[PDB]
């Protein structure tokens, strides 16, 4: 119904047409969480090595 904001270029054009109207963590918390599992994992491994040592 209502074309609006028409703009034209050599390249093309652009506009808007309305048919009807309406009605965060930090570098440290990251390094903490990364190293929290580099540990949980290093422990799961040393536990394996220990069982193998028996």
């Amino acid at each position: 119904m209502e074309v609006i904001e028409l703009n034209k270029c050599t390249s093309g054009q652009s506009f808007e047409v309305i048919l009807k109207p309406p009605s965060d963590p930090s570098l440290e918390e990251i390094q903490k969480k990364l190293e929290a599992a580099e540990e949980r994992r290093k422990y799961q491994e040393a536990e394996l090595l220990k069982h193998l040592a028996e």
Binding site: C9, G12, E16, P22, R41
Partner: protein, 439 residues
Amino acid sequence: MRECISIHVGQAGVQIGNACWELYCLEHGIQPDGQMPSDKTIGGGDDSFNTFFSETGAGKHVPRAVFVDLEPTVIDEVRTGTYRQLFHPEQLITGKEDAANNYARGHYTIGKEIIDLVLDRIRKLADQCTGLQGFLVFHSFGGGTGSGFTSLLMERLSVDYGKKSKLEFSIYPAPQVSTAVVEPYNSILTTHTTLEHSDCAFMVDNEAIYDICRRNLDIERPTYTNLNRLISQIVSSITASLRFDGALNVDLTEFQTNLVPYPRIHFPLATYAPVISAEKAYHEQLSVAEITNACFEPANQMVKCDPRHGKYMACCLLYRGDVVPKDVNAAIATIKTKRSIQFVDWCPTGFKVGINYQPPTVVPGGDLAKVQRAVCMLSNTTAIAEAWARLDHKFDLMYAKRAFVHWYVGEGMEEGEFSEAREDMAALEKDYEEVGVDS
């Protein structure tokens, strides 16, 4: 003029990036060695294409791109391919051993060992930028790198660049081309961890691309280069406003305001017409009416789903070729009576329209016929949550038996991160349904 840095993560992001930069070079007339015969801004300039390429004093135009895979096989192809002289060694980053389709191995294990190197190489580009506005990030949901490194990068990006926009082009997993049974697990994880860090995400379901290739390119068994040449058209369409003179979607912040009133619901649906086999013995060319109408057929979307059952929040039409507005509003006037296009109470039923007179560029020897006019629709419809319910279901069946979970835990990740990711996704499906509630 404000620069945009492209980041391509994993196999899917790297090969897809290559397809885009190939197209970008054809579209901007930039040879396989970075020489742009029609630039007179020799050694610089603040032109519209300068948002995506910087320039060498020697006349070389070089993508503002960073590719990064935890294994070298793919990116090696890039450092020996037809566009080698284009990129410079310091932007092609490979590890040696990959994520084994394991979100945890890419986020927690092999990620830690490389996040810094990459953030280095990314700020190296941020410093050849006069007013960098943000990042376009290309990655799969299903690989270990594409899901797990990508979500790690995103969080550090929202730390080293708190005021910059981040858009994603995300490949959603489809069994016809997938290589891992655990892709659903990786899809959910990286979405949950990337959600609050992405401003707007364009999801392409390999299922959808794969069928457009069989149905409309009559290709028996689409390959990645088939899929990726088509994905590059759609990506080029979405980014043409950043690379050319115009007044619609002129910077990454505008995609947010145009497509995303609700920040969590930042997954606008792409639809592309027409896709025509370059083998077809001449095609009767399609009108502004016909291609505009083809935007409301599910068989043309990057995600199969039914926008009839769902409400709209924003709609953008992006035209390339022989199009003038009078045709556009006549076409829109018609489809509106023939089709189920319901917006939300708090948004005006309307379309933002962008026309670039240059018709779409085809890759010599690709599968796509050249055409006089083409259009990409960007519509934020709640119907796209059908793809969330599909993925969440597959996740529920496997997780209720902890199937394969031991692979992630094995890498340091806590079983509970699984359930946290899944509850966040359960909130998302809730948001979406709130907005489409009438009928």
